[PDB]
Amino acid sequence: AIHAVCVLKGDSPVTGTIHLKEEGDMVTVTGEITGLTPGKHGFHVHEFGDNTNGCTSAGGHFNPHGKEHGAPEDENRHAGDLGNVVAGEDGKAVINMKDKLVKLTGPDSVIGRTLVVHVDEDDLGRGGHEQSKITGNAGGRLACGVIGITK
């Protein structure tokens, strides 16, 4: 089973380590993000593992299948759409999810792409804003990291 890791850093006090592994026929995503305002923050795989311009150079959500932005539970979602992380009152969010569209092998592999955590909540495509079906209207990028191969 392939194992990957991602260390989050950006123009904010937000930090965290995310681990990804193949488990059965899905990918299991786990970790903790700290330094967040309490509540929901958008969390996605973005297309490029490019940190030449902070988190901005990561580009948009990873979307190899040409879908609209949605919830993890939807069929019409970007491959990179992992919904929201929920920070407690102490500013810390813990992830423990299994996803069928995130891949660590094959044409839709996310190795070498980016994870991003956002300023605002991801509205799952349903907020009625111009960016809802593009980004979930999740606002700016607090921290990001390139997804790398680990032991």
| Count of all residues that appear for the chain in the document | 151
Q: How is residue 103 annotated by DSSP?
A: B
67 binds, among Cu ion, its own copies, Zn ion, none (CB under 5 to 8 A by kind): none
Report, in Å, the least distance between residue 65 CB and Zn ion: 11
Phi then psi for residue 56, to 5 deg, are -65, -35
Nearer to its own copies, 39 or 59 (CB): 59
Q: 91, 37 in Cβ contact below 8 A?
A: yes
Q: Where do runs of H (alpha helix) occur along the chain? A: 132-135
Residue 133 in contact with Cu ion, rule: CB under 5 A: no
What residues act catalytically?
Answer: 44, 46, 61, 69, 78, 81, 118, 141
Nearer to its own copies, 34 or 51 (CB): 51
Nearer to its own copies, 95 or 147 (CB): 147
Tell the residue number behind the tokens 């903790």, with chain if given. 32
Binding site for its own copies (CB under 8 A): 4-5, 7, 17, 47-52, 57, 59, 111-114, 145-151
Q: How many CA atoms lie within 13 A of 40 on its CB side?
A: 12
116 binds, among its own copies, Cu ion, Zn ion, none (CB under 5 to 8 A by kind): Cu ion
